[PDB]
Write an enzyme that holds these catalytic residues in place. Structure first.
Site, PDB file in Angstrom:
ATOM      1  N   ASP A   1     -12.474   8.890  -7.433  1.00  0.00           N
ATOM      2  CA  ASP A   1     -13.706   9.514  -6.943  1.00  0.00           C
ATOM      3  C   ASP A   1     -13.449  10.849  -6.237  1.00  0.00           C
ATOM      4  O   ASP A   1     -14.391  11.503  -5.766  1.00  0.00           O
ATOM      5  CB  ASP A   1     -14.470   8.550  -6.039  1.00  0.00           C
ATOM      6  CG  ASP A   1     -13.806   8.245  -4.702  1.00  0.00           C
ATOM      7  OD1 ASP A   1     -12.656   8.704  -4.422  1.00  0.00           O
ATOM      8  OD2 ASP A   1     -14.459   7.522  -3.935  1.00  0.00           O
TER       9      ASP A   1
ATOM     10  N   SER B   1     -11.591  11.192  -3.501  1.00  0.00           N
ATOM     11  CA  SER B   1     -10.979  10.912  -2.203  1.00  0.00           C
ATOM     12  C   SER B   1      -9.473  10.701  -2.338  1.00  0.00           C
ATOM     13  O   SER B   1      -8.954  10.717  -3.435  1.00  0.00           O
ATOM     14  CB  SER B   1     -11.586   9.721  -1.564  1.00  0.00           C
ATOM     15  OG  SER B   1     -11.300   8.556  -2.287  1.00  0.00           O
TER      16      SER B   1
ATOM     17  N   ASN C   1      -7.557   9.270  -5.397  1.00  0.00           N
ATOM     18  CA  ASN C   1      -8.386   8.247  -6.011  1.00  0.00           C
ATOM     19  C   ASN C   1      -9.304   8.904  -7.062  1.00  0.00           C
ATOM     20  O   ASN C   1      -9.553  10.101  -7.008  1.00  0.00           O
ATOM     21  CB  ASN C   1      -9.300   7.622  -4.935  1.00  0.00           C
ATOM     22  CG  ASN C   1      -8.517   7.033  -3.773  1.00  0.00           C
ATOM     23  OD1 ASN C   1      -8.851   7.177  -2.584  1.00  0.00           O
ATOM     24  ND2 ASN C   1      -7.470   6.330  -4.109  1.00  0.00           N
TER      25      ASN C   1
ATOM     26  N   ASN D   1      -8.710   5.716   3.469  1.00  0.00           N
ATOM     27  CA  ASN D   1      -9.396   6.548   2.501  1.00  0.00           C
ATOM     28  C   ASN D   1     -10.269   7.618   3.165  1.00  0.00           C
ATOM     29  O   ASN D   1     -11.044   7.329   4.055  1.00  0.00           O
ATOM     30  CB  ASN D   1     -10.156   5.604   1.582  1.00  0.00           C
ATOM     31  CG  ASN D   1     -10.878   6.280   0.426  1.00  0.00           C
ATOM     32  OD1 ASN D   1     -12.061   6.652   0.508  1.00  0.00           O
ATOM     33  ND2 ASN D   1     -10.172   6.469  -0.669  1.00  0.00           N
TER      34      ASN D   1
ATOM     35  N   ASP E   1      -6.116   8.408  -0.340  1.00  0.00           N
ATOM     36  CA  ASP E   1      -5.656   7.438   0.634  1.00  0.00           C
ATOM     37  C   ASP E   1      -4.396   7.958   1.326  1.00  0.00           C
ATOM     38  O   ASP E   1      -3.504   8.549   0.691  1.00  0.00           O
ATOM     39  CB  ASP E   1      -5.313   6.128  -0.074  1.00  0.00           C
ATOM     40  CG  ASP E   1      -6.472   5.262  -0.569  1.00  0.00           C
ATOM     41  OD1 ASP E   1      -7.616   5.584  -0.316  1.00  0.00           O
ATOM     42  OD2 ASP E   1      -6.176   4.248  -1.270  1.00  0.00           O
TER      43      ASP E   1
ATOM     44  N   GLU F   1       0.833  -1.205   0.000  1.00  0.00           N
ATOM     45  CA  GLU F   1       0.000   0.000   0.000  1.00  0.00           C
ATOM     46  C   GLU F   1       0.867   1.255   0.000  1.00  0.00           C
ATOM     47  O   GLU F   1       0.569   2.182  -0.752  1.00  0.00           O
ATOM     48  CB  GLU F   1      -0.883  -0.029   1.264  1.00  0.00           C
ATOM     49  CG  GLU F   1      -2.064  -1.001   1.203  1.00  0.00           C
ATOM     50  CD  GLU F   1      -3.154  -0.687   0.197  1.00  0.00           C
ATOM     51  OE1 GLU F   1      -3.117   0.434  -0.356  1.00  0.00           O
ATOM     52  OE2 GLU F   1      -3.953  -1.598  -0.121  1.00  0.00           O
TER      53      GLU F   1
END
Ligand code: NA
Length: 129
Positions: free
Chosen positions: A48, A50, A46, A59, A52, A35
């Site tokens: 959308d 958002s 991301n 998120n 991380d 990750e």
């Protein structure tokens, strides 16, 4: 902070992730590796809108507030910047809520694609635990 593998294993065990919800420590180290590359400061936007954040790529749509993710939740009740700290307390406490949420560690796409079903115990081999 960029952790070493065994350094992070020790911190994740200190904070209670070993066998949390039945996921052995090597699952959590492997997840962090893929990750964030063991980097507490990692951020990734991301599609959308958002983002991380942190060593476990938590998120902002669900878990933290970052000021720029409309309509999102803040279930860990924390600013997302708190998840970039050298101190992984906040990230671990939030992770515990994530993994309890229903889909277990499938919440972590790198875990599902690169850790799940593999010899995760390798990630703690050699460490003084
Ligand atoms: Na949010």
């Amino acid at each position: 902070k960029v952790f070493g593998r065994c350094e992070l294993a020790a911190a994740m065990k200190r904070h209670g992730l070993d066998n949390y919800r039945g996921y052995s420590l090597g699952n959590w180290v492997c997840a962090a590796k893929f990750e964030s590359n063991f980097n507490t400061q990692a951020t990734n936007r991301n599609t959308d809108g958002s983002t991380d954040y942190g060593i476990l790529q938590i998120n902002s749509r669900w878990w933290c507030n970052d000021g720029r993710t409309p309509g999102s939740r803040n279930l860990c009740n924390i600013p997302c910047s708190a998840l970039l700290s050298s101190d992984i307390t906040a990230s671990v406490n939030c992770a515990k809520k994530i993994v309890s949420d229903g889909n277990g560690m499938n919440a972590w796409v790198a875990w599902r694609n690169r850790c799940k079903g593999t010899d995760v115990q390798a990630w703690i081999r050699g460490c003084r635990l």
